[PDB]
Design an enzyme around this catalytic site. Structure first.
Site, mmCIF file in Angstrom:
data_model
loop_
_atom_site.group_PDB
_atom_site.id
_atom_site.type_symbol
_atom_site.label_atom_id
_atom_site.label_comp_id
_atom_site.label_asym_id
_atom_site.label_seq_id
_atom_site.Cartn_x
_atom_site.Cartn_y
_atom_site.Cartn_z
ATOM 1 N N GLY A 1 0.810 -1.230 0.000
ATOM 2 C CA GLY A 1 0.000 0.000 0.000
ATOM 3 C C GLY A 1 0.833 1.264 0.000
ATOM 4 C CE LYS B 1 -2.036 5.862 -1.046
ATOM 5 N NZ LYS B 1 -2.502 4.604 -0.403
ATOM 6 C CG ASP C 1 -5.501 5.932 1.027
ATOM 7 O OD1 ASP C 1 -6.214 5.359 0.165
ATOM 8 O OD2 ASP C 1 -4.264 5.902 1.058
ATOM 9 C CG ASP C 2 -2.557 9.844 1.850
ATOM 10 O OD1 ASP C 2 -3.003 10.225 2.967
ATOM 11 O OD2 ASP C 2 -1.493 9.201 1.690
HETATM 12 C C1 LIG Z 1 -4.258 4.664 3.936
HETATM 13 C C2 LIG Z 1 -2.778 4.868 4.055
HETATM 14 O O1 LIG Z 1 -2.122 4.479 5.025
HETATM 15 N N1 LIG Z 1 -2.224 5.491 3.021
HETATM 16 C C3 LIG Z 1 -0.847 5.958 3.009
HETATM 17 C C4 LIG Z 1 -0.532 6.716 4.305
HETATM 18 N N2 LIG Z 1 0.861 7.059 4.208
HETATM 19 C C5 LIG Z 1 1.297 8.258 3.753
HETATM 20 N N3 LIG Z 1 0.469 9.169 3.352
HETATM 21 C C6 LIG Z 1 0.893 10.416 2.723
HETATM 22 C C7 LIG Z 1 1.201 11.459 3.763
HETATM 23 C C8 LIG Z 1 2.332 12.253 3.650
HETATM 24 C C9 LIG Z 1 2.616 13.206 4.617
HETATM 25 C C10 LIG Z 1 1.779 13.367 5.697
HETATM 26 C C11 LIG Z 1 0.658 12.580 5.823
HETATM 27 C C12 LIG Z 1 0.367 11.625 4.860
HETATM 28 S S1 LIG Z 1 3.026 8.293 3.699
HETATM 29 C C13 LIG Z 1 3.152 6.681 4.530
HETATM 30 C C14 LIG Z 1 1.827 5.966 4.223
HETATM 31 C C15 LIG Z 1 1.630 5.240 2.892
HETATM 32 O O2 LIG Z 1 2.488 4.101 2.815
HETATM 33 C C16 LIG Z 1 0.148 4.832 2.743
HETATM 34 O O3 LIG Z 1 -0.095 4.371 1.419
#
Ligand SMILES: CC(=O)N[C@H]1CN2/C(=N/Cc3ccccc3)SC[C@@H]2[C@@H](O)[C@@H]1O
Ligand SMILES: CC(=O)N[C@H]1CN2/C(=N/Cc3ccccc3)SC[C@@H]2[C@@H](O)[C@@H]1O
Lengths: 430, 436
Positions: A9, A40, A116-117
């Site tokens: 993920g 992703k 997400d994101d």
């Molecule tokens: C649902 C989920 O866990 N999605 C992501 C969350 N995440 C990240 N997200 C981006 C982000 C960057 C900076 C601040 C907050 C979020 S980076 C690590 C992980 C990434 O592995 C993962 O797919």
């Protein structure tokens, strides 16, 4: 029917088919049971979610899905249309169903819709036909659950997937309230803990979320994810999650390091923790994980005289070597014992530098010896027979060997552009 | 007869055979003529130099060496025995001889021996039989050169392969004196210039080394190498080497970034430098020529049109030349950021210092906003890179562009805050590095 295993993920270079098959081999072995496909930057999973798999892509997914049945691992296909979709447009909903139909044709039973994101601001045309953002997601989601005839396993990741991400908080979130009401109760919900990379997932927080989710959540655990920080690897054990949470959850899938071969501990010690109450000791789970991991280093993937240069390749990797490595590259919030210690010993050898000044000279000489263990660990690793493991961790092992060979020249100097532009900015922030 | 091309000479994951074939194709297209095989951590090149290639490994090598011949690229096989050879023992000399004869039967006509990044201290039996490290290396090297039939190209890389590494200096080095005196005259010597990673290679420095070694060297150039620093990538142009060096050199072989696809600029600009003198060479114009050519590869793998009411396509905007010019300025050269990178660092140096005044508070408000715009062009650059159709190039650069995107967005929200946990970045290496 507890989903426990590995979500691919993370951001960046996805795992290839060879590595995923081998992960099934490892999941079955350790008695875990689920794989969530969600890389992703695999173009067709998110960025080009509308695009159909080609024949070659179809054949490699069929073989991979077959490989998951062959190892008694449930394969869940996730798709991420959040960035790009107009939820109100039926030709879009059609496009998503077509994509998910092709994957069922590959022999896929289970599915996921991730949100997400992405940003919580809908387009003019979705603003009209839908109340809030949650409403639009729950609609698209349910209608797909049903069109696929209510599969056993169908996951949904909300835009608000951790505590901090809930506006204004968890228990009064109007996005989340709508998820517990309007989203069908057969669909499961993904949650990362208080934070994106939770230090702890305490039982209080899981009861709290459950109350508004109106379900036991599936935990998407980013504890060992290293996609967010170039220099960081995580070889420490599963920690800050209590055996007590298992009965309050529908499952726990771990999102580990981008480097496949470095997820031995992360995916091993998680199995130790699942066996535990289907109680759990981190520091013992790890020695268990490290001892078995040490097996792979010697398997691929002259006897010199007393007057002759001895073999550079003579010495092999040892459970002590690996134990140091793990302490250097431990967890997102603590360094391993030997790590935090080397650190302290340096802070004090730098402060009390004294131009009873003997406590120093034969204390930073136990440091010149411990900095030579880091160097020893790299040299033996650089000679191991499993080149696949070496290559996966080369950049990180070299880095820590380099900083400790420079910290050594210093803590033996006191007795007599590094990082590029990103670095120059870093060194001017907080 | 000038050897110009690439040496796969760096530490870490070597290139795979598919990448090497692709390299030969690029070298031919840009009119370069040499590949030097020397991956520090390919198994049987250095650590296990003694072991012979499996039948599978032998098939792969032969396919690779025929590919080189087909692409009119000279293939030079190098081996690195100096970690644990015994030079006096004629059985050790016989193992080396066997290894090189095997590769010779695979079709290879050009060879090299490398004695770089090994410690100076010989062992008992060698100390007895040989006067100095130089005497031993020159001995087994000259033997091998003669055994293989005095091949037209055979390289030697000294233990003292740059200025900083010569004891006690280039001119009065007994090691290099032995090499220039004893080492046979038909063997070429590799040199990294004044440093391992040379900022400049001044012509004065080539005449200095040329005297103590009694021939024009072949440069092993580490200008664009990035094995030594996990966060670094070098996309800037070949720079700091006068076209006046060419007539004073046997050649230039560049040892570039580990990430295969980040070496378009490094290899393309070297070609432009070489070809400019067979003010002839402008790094800046070389760089634009390279990024312009590179841009075309980005939209090539290795319909629903939304209404004005609807959510627009995230994936719509493709990578631009201006995106690649920014990326190269962010990841430029070992000792120099590119203009935009230096500029962004300068306007942040300043907004941080002149922070108090938030009069001159009419200026700062303007500057801080022009800075927020530039941080915006870095995010936009990341977003369009992550949508491009060439996933191979994206994967090789992903972690570098993710990192500069994430730091610029931290910096952007610090400059916004001054006008008013993914986000201990660096791990343990980080905290030790912050005490020096
Ligand atoms: C649902 C989920 O866990 N999605 C992501 C969350 N995440 C990240 N997200 C981006 C982000 C960057 C900076 C601040 C907050 C979020 S980076 C690590 C992980 C990434 O592995 C993962 O797919
Ligand atoms: C002939 C030659 O260039 N050999 C090497 C030198 N080098 C490095 N040397 C190791 C080193 C580490 C720390 C301090 C000084 C030297 S790293 C870059 C390059 C590496 O690509 C290359 O194979």
């Amino acid at each position: 029917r507890f989903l426990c295993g590995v979500v691919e993920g993370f951001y960046g270079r996805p795992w290839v088919m060879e590595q995923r098959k081998e992960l099934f081999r490892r999941l079955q072995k350790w008695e875990l049971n689920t794989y969530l496909y969600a890389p992703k930057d695999d173009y067709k999973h998110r960025m080009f979610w509308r695009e159909m798999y080609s024949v070659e892509e179809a054949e490699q997914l069929m073989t991979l899905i077959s490989a998951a049945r062959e190892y008694e691992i449930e394969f869940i296909y996730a798709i991420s249309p959040g960035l790009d979709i107009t939820f109100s447009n039926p030709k879009e909903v059609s496009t998503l169903k077509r994509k998910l139909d092709q994957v069922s044709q590959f022999g896929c039973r289970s599915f996921a819709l991730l949100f997400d994101d992405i940003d919580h601001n809908m387009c003019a045309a979705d603003k009209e036909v839908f109340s809030s953002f949650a409403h639009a997601q729950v609609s698209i989601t349910n209608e797909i659950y049903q069109y696929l005839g209510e599969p056993e396993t169908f996951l949904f990741c909300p835009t608000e997937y951790c505590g901090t991400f809930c506006y204004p908080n968890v228990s009064q979130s109007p996005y989340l309230r709508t998820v517990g009401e309007k989203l069908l109760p057969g669909i499961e919900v993904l949650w990362t803990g208080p934070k994106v990379v939770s230090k702890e997932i305490p039982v209080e927080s899981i009861e709290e979320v459950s109350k508004i989710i109106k379900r036991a959540p599936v935990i998407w655990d980013n504890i060992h994810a290293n996609d967010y920080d170039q220099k960081r690897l995580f070889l420490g054990p599963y920690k800050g999650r209590s055996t007590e949470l298992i009965p309050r959850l529908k499952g726990v899938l771990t999102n580990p390091n981008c480097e496949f071969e470095a997820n031995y501990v992360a995916i091993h010690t998680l199995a130790t923790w699942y066996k535990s109450n289907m109680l759990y000791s981190p520091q013992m789970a790890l020695k268990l994980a490290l001892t078995e991991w040490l097996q792979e280093f010697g398997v691929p993937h002259f006897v010199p005289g007393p007057n002759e240069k001895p073999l550079y390749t003579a010495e092999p990797v040892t459970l002590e070597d690996l134990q140091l490595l793990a302490d250097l590259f431990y967890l997102p919030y603590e360094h391993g014992p030997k790590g935090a210690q080397m650190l302290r010993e340096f802070q004090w050898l730098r402060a009390n530098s004294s131009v009873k000044i003997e406590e120093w000279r034969s204390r930073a000489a136990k440091f010149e010896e411990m900095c030579g263990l880091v160097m020893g660990m790299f040299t033996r690793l650089s000679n191991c027979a499993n080149r696949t493991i070496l290559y996966d961790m080369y950049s990180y092992v070299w880095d820590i060997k380099s900083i400790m060979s420079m910290v050594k020249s210093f803590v033996q100097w006191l007795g007599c552009f590094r990082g590029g532009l990103a670095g120059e900015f870093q060194r001017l922030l907080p």
